[PDB]
Design an enzyme around this catalytic site. Structure first.
Site, short mmCIF file in Angstrom:
data_model
loop_
_atom_site.label_atom_id
_atom_site.label_comp_id
_atom_site.label_asym_id
_atom_site.label_seq_id
_atom_site.Cartn_x
_atom_site.Cartn_y
_atom_site.Cartn_z
CG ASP A 69 16.02 64.60 52.63
OD1 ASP A 69 16.35 65.50 53.43
OD2 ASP A 69 16.67 63.55 52.49
CD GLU A 93 30.90 93.17 33.92
OE1 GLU A 93 29.72 92.96 34.29
OE2 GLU A 93 31.27 93.03 32.74
#
Lengths: 673, 600, 673
Positions: free
Chosen positions: C486, C553
């Protein structure tokens, strides 16, 4: 079940739950009055200007200004024709139209038939309309037939089998459509002022993008209550399903053969036949309508000697077009039969008479793969009879053999029967994966063009007729790669055919009109459990290499085969399909099968996409018998019928989460006491 | 302008407002690349079977498996056909169609034309495609022509006028349908797999069931924003407007004459001409399309005489009665007549004998003449190879009769009644005849100009009928002094309502019980607005109807026909406050109001 | 930008894009007149002019009021009736600031204005002040309220709403953002009907855990590119109540504020009360422009300075290290995995000498700390058993009380003692429990009605003191739950934590929050590339174990880090977010970011369900200048802006197929010339 009130000049087609009212107008034509729920018999329905009345077979060239259903072309160049009632007769039992497939009746008091004859004066032609009503089923069929008595040469450009009209425009069209690998999806649309229709022009095969089926249901109708009307057409070629409404709020729906390239021509003494439609009325829902089709097609339409037996367990095999080694094939089956326990092995391509006897003596049957076409390089027909190939002159050819001409048909039948006469083949598989282009025949007059599609379909029909009446002990697959010959006629000739979330949606879409047995499903190289759970409902098969699977998979497939061999009698030949949840407007699917005496059942629940932190689930069955203490298994507990149908079965959604990912499924089994 | 890009074989056409692009493909056929908002120029738009590609004149039997736009039958009995590009050229202006009506350009700097020639070698036939782009407006016209150079005969079974394709099915068809006494009700429907269409098979009357016009709009398009497409066919006979979507979400529309009973035979050296279609694109709502169509029709279509001139007031049912001259300019029974030249039970205009007979018979007795027809058609047969041409020949006959009459007498103004409200008649007859009339006028205003409709006042009070009848051609069929006041008002604003103005639609009779429209001068100097209710209510909320198409600058005087002054902006957003039950219930139901917006 | 027409007694606030227009009624209340598009100033608006039917700014029940009220005060007489009248007003420049709570600010005093109006009541001798603020060069307006007590009488407050806005018609829609955890912040839109529609949050702590405190109100035909839309946001973290109510006379009314379910604040002589702030934004172009206004305002004038312009650093986390207190394995980690891969921030979860060692390698340091939670065993409990929150003779199952200042000062002393010695530069606060039995054992009976609003202020001041003592530490205001998301936390902590079910969460939450605040992360069915293609937009982070990973990776992770380090300047601090396709309608998602000057951009889109034999797609983008030529795909071509916006970029559906299954992504980059 058919009575003629002479005073009012009207008919009445009784049944247990279906009524059909007809009347003969002053002009001499036929007009409909009512069609729906049963009505008690009354002696006078009198209390119930074209373009404002409901006709049985409209014709253009009068005050009526809507789309017509018939169009003739005389020698003087006119499209004007009309004709009225002269005679009728009431008969008992189906007679059957010779050149085309149709339904039949075994006993005598099983069905009734009405035939009414209408005659034209200026051109001297005859038209005969046939109606049929089945006892114990809410089903009505009709067709038409043309005969010419005079000397004039007429040409037919439009001919439809059926035409039904209503007085209200509040309905909801339903259709099945889709491209390949996603075919037979359910679509529905609201009726609006104008024209809505579906069609097909593939030529060689039936609809590849649309299916010869159409429904008409109230907006509030669901799977369990509401009104619904269903129309189905028995044909394999081009067709047209049209449903137009007028500004005066009247609906007219018609089925038939596509007039896009129809130019049939008649002479004196000739006659023409048209395919028939099947109409079913249900006031309880789509489940009831689908059950009516399932029962009727399974009993009264499929070939005898296959309506009571259960289909075998096939085992094809994929490969890289290897050599014609004999030992590997014989060893493979021995492994498959000895271990898995299947009952039929099929060979593909050409990679053989001696091989047939060895497989049969081992303890299992045999099958082949065949395609019926020709090649411009090695078929030797190109250097033997070049003209037998289809294709107009002076146009580039992009091959398909011409079945319009009878000689070709006989050549193949004498050739293929030479192979189906010494071996022990008990299973064969027909294939077709081409679309007709340049539909021109080099063995017909210029005036006889335009009959090519219909003659081609008639040729494939009579080839099947001769072959299946010569060797009435083998099984047939309609198509192998095209996937576009899924129509009732092929079911009449070939008892079955060929069709996991995609599979669930396809099967749910296609179960509206065709029975479960005719569907062909297989397990290919998501764990095997979900694929088996979705392939149980229908014909069951395998496409796998036994070398590439480990012993755990062998145990799994043995268990699966045992289960299917136990329950296939209930699933296939004696059951009622019920649809519970829809893949559409949701992400869950569900259906179940219930015996005819409410004593055994099999329910399945499927999921398409995993949901995390979701809500819990209630699974409400249907069709069971209230007040009967069923015993549910798969963990066993006992429950009454009514509360099991009303509160449902609890589903712990974490339990399916363990089963796998995004493709969880469950099965349940019921009993009597 | 139009360019041909000889390196890549691409044609680009544009009015600086839209940009359409085609391309010559491998087998000599034509393609479509993009059609819509205007785009700039590159040199190579190369990065952008036959059943999956987009073509602009399809033919059946060569791999395509959808409804075709052309079908010709040859002697061999075949129905196959091919065409390939052979040459092309560019005009400047608009040559026009000799035997058929069409829009006309006056100066040579107003439009530019492209023509592409396609040739078939087996049947020795020529196909010509014609395109036109208008300067100052976003419109495009298309048609086709058939020529035969060989010897053998061929028969035309189906000849369409246009074929436009898209790449998505996300649209919403808009049609204009109705029946007698309730014509032209607007209806919407969602496109779905299959075929949806509107047709008409009535006979001589031009679209007695559906008007020959369809639209195609996005789901979110309202009257003030969004995309929309418009197709209009300039013809009076039987027609057909398909709209097919395939299973790969490829829409394809087509317009033309109905192939139900059409069969035209082409011999050596013969020709056939097809009706012309008009297309309009808009990116600001339905209103923009409406002004485009309105300005075009009354600018380069309606006769050169009744263009800058207003229409005469009129009265219907002798010298004693005519002595009541309360402002009326013309009497019907100057002087006007009414005739029916087609019934005797129906004449056969296909032949020329009847045409000449009636021409002489009427010219013998020949400033306002009407025309009526009350029967459609029955038994379409004429007293053996020309039996399929009867409808088209009948239409051509009435067309040439009109041409002869209007060439002979150049001042007489003609009307029409039956609903034959096509864009054809307007070319010869500049105006036509048409509470309940509120919905009829609202629907008709999508395409036709406001002057086209003929309104009349019959014998609820009379003021509401007058208010609804102001918009259009005003006519008639203690209280007399009010009638004098009415004609006093109408003679003051017809120079704005009739000739120089823009029509705007604000509220909608469908999905509501209000109706509001207004007109504005070319510049923002004057306006008149009106608001009609239908059935009065109770405990309703306050009202504040706003305005649009207005200048956001100078002042205005809102004379509530109490005068107050206000700027353009407010009139856009806040609106004019209306007090229910104070003035609307003061007259009752069907209440109406007027307003004026003088500038300074 | 504010003018008072004293002749007519009406105010006028305008900003060359918006216009708020007020009036003073005859009885001393304030009446609204207009709110929307800008209006040129006129001399008087007399013609624009029964208490239940008028539009009132701050309604009060009784006195003819019959709708839901906005203010309710209880007096010692037992009555609940008050009224207010206008006495004065004031105008100045620049935001002033509400001391107890957080709020937006202005940095140059020529970018904002202010209006303060005072209202007084004589029966109780109390004052109310309403404040209005307008931002220049933004279409935004704020408002709040303040209560003052003058007389000696005691009053008790039971309702206190921050704002109330009201219109003339019910033709609207409600756009809310609501969902449970792991599927949070979806988008549900709802029509308006006669009655009450509202959302609320009664969670004791954190709040906003099933309904984010945001609400919109848009026209039915409004889309992402055209339409008219209103916005309302509330800068608060406790229990809220967003309510939209319509009457039988067709007059809507929308109001925000604190949930009055357990609000019983009382005001004594000389005391005061301050209410939170709301933010209102009006857009005439669509949801994209409204979202852009929020993004810019929150990123510039609300987020804490010293972090508004610097880009967030790449971070790495280690939770898969289980729990063993060994040493030098973390040193080996940070030495040869994290530093080598190129991550500059290393976050340790769960002394001080270790922190200095990490800085030697060139990295920063982080830590995890839960503050407001205790265990009965904790020394705090044994020594101070009442400091907890609960009620006598009641069971509970432990939250630490913040209403008392003693707990706040104790916690602050402990944490500051921890932070001073070490070189910490990144702290993640946590709270993963709700509040049960909201009772305080330190106040008397009268004060036991304000604890829920009190400890919110307690934690606010705790962060105030902490962040003003250490103004160089980043904060992450969540670790599990994602419920403290918020605007107020954004004012204190610049950012916070948050494939399928993530590309939908991000799309939902990007209406009213800048993409800098996103706490995206990469964790290890799906390839790594498609996860990075989603994690790019927002803060980039890694949650893996580099010890257990293959070289293929680690060769791609370096490229990913390089790409993010290249483009994070554009993505985060200066760019405009644009939404193109929505996942709540189709099965695709698309967005892009454009620099302030149309010079460069980045675009992407995703699909969720793999398709076969599907249709063509033309991915068309917007928010771009039709000026010049630029394009790069991943080779490249060139295109003008207008063409690129109108015909789009062709996409070959085969390309998505080879880029993995069921989750395919693509990336595009633009240039200048």
């Amino acid at each position: 079940a058919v009575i003629f009130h002479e005073k009012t000049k009207e008919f009445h087609i009784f049944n247990r739950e279906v009524s059909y009212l007809m009347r003969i107008m002053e002009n001499g034509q036929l007009e409909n009055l009512y069609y729906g729920k049963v009505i008690r018999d009354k002696e006078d329905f009198g209390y119930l200007s074209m373009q404002y009345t409901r006709q049985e077979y409209p014709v253009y060239g009068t005050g009526d200004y809507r789309s017509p259903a018939l169009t003739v072309l005389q020698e003087n160049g006119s499209r004007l024709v009309d004709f009225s009632y002269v005679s009728h007769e009431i008969y008992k039992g189906k007679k059957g139209i010779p050149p085309l497939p149709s339904t039949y009746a075994e006993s005598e008091d099983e069905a009734e038939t009405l035939e009414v004859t209408l005659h034209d004066q200026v051109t001297d032609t005859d038209l005969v309309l046939t109606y049929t009503i089945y006892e114990d089923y809410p089903v009505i069929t009709r067709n038409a037939r043309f005969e010419q008595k005079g000397e004039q040469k007429i040409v037919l450009e439009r001919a439809m089998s059926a035409s039904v009209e209503f007085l209200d425009m509040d309905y909801e069209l339903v259709q099945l459509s889709g491209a390949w690998s996603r075919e037979r999806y359910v679509k529905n649309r609201k009726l609006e002022m104008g024209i809505q229709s579906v069609h097909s022009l593939n030529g060689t095969c039936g609809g590849a993008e649309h299916n010869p089926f159409i429904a008409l249901k109230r907006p509030q109708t669901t799977e369990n209550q509401g009104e619904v009307y269903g129309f189905s057409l028995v044909y394999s070629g081009n067709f047209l399903a049209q449903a137009e409404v007028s500004t005066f709020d009247m609906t007219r729906v018609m089925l038939g053969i596509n007039p896009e390239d129809f130019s049939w021509e008649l002479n004196q003494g000739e006659s023409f036949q048209t395919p028939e439609v099947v109409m079913v009325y249900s006031d309880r829902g789509l489940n009831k309508m689908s059950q009516a089709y399932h029962r009727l097609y399974r009993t009264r339409l499929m070939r005898v000697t296959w309506r009571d037996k259960a289909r075998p367990i096939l085992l094809n095999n994929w490969e890289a077009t290897y050599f014609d080694f004999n030992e590997e094939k014989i060893l493979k089956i021995a492994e498959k039969a000895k271990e898995a326990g299947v009952e039929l092995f099929v060979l593909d391509d050409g990679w053989i008479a001696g091989l047939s006897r060895k497989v049969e003596a081992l303890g299992l049957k045999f099958g082949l793969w065949v395609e019926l076409e020709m090649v411009n390089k090695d078929s030797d027909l190109y250097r033997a009879h070049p003209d037998w190939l289809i294709g107009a002159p002076d146009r580039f050819e992009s091959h398909v053999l011409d079945f319009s001409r009878k000689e070709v048909v006989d050549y193949i039948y004498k050739m293929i029967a030479k192979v189906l006469r010494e071996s022990s083949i008990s299973y064969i598989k027909w294939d077709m994966n081409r679309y007709m282009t340049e539909p021109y025949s080099r063995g017909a007059d210029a005036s006889q063009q335009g009959k090519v599609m219909h003659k081609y379909i008639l040729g494939v029909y009579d080839l099947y007729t001769r072959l299946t009446t010569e060797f009435p002990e083998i099984l047939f697959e309609s198509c192998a790669s095209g996937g576009a010959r899924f129509d009732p006629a092929m079911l009449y000739f070939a008892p079955q055919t060929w069709t996991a979330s995609e599979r669930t949606k396809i099967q749910y879409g296609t179960s509206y009109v065709y029975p479960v047995v005719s569907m062909g499903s297989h397990v290919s190289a998501t764990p095997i459990e979900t694929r088996a759970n979705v392939a149980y409902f229908g014909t069951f098969g395998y496409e796998l290499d036994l070398n590439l699977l480990s012993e755990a998979e062998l145990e799994s497939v043995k268990k699966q085969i045992a289960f299917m061999k136990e329950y296939r009698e209930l699933i296939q030949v004696d059951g009622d399909f019920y649809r519970l949840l829809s893949p559409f407007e949701g992400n869950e699917t569900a259906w179940m099968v219930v015996a005819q005496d409410k004593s055994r059942a099999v329910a399945a629940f499927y999921q398409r996409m995993n949901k995390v932190n979701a809500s819990w689930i209630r699974f409400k069955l249907q069709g069971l018998d209230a007040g009967t203490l069923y015993e549910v298994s798969c963990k066993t507990y006992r429950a009454y019928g009514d509360e099991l149908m009303q509160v449902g079965i609890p589903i712990d959604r974490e339990d399916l989460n363990k089963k796998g990912g995004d493709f969880a499924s469950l099965l349940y089994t019921l009993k009597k006491v």
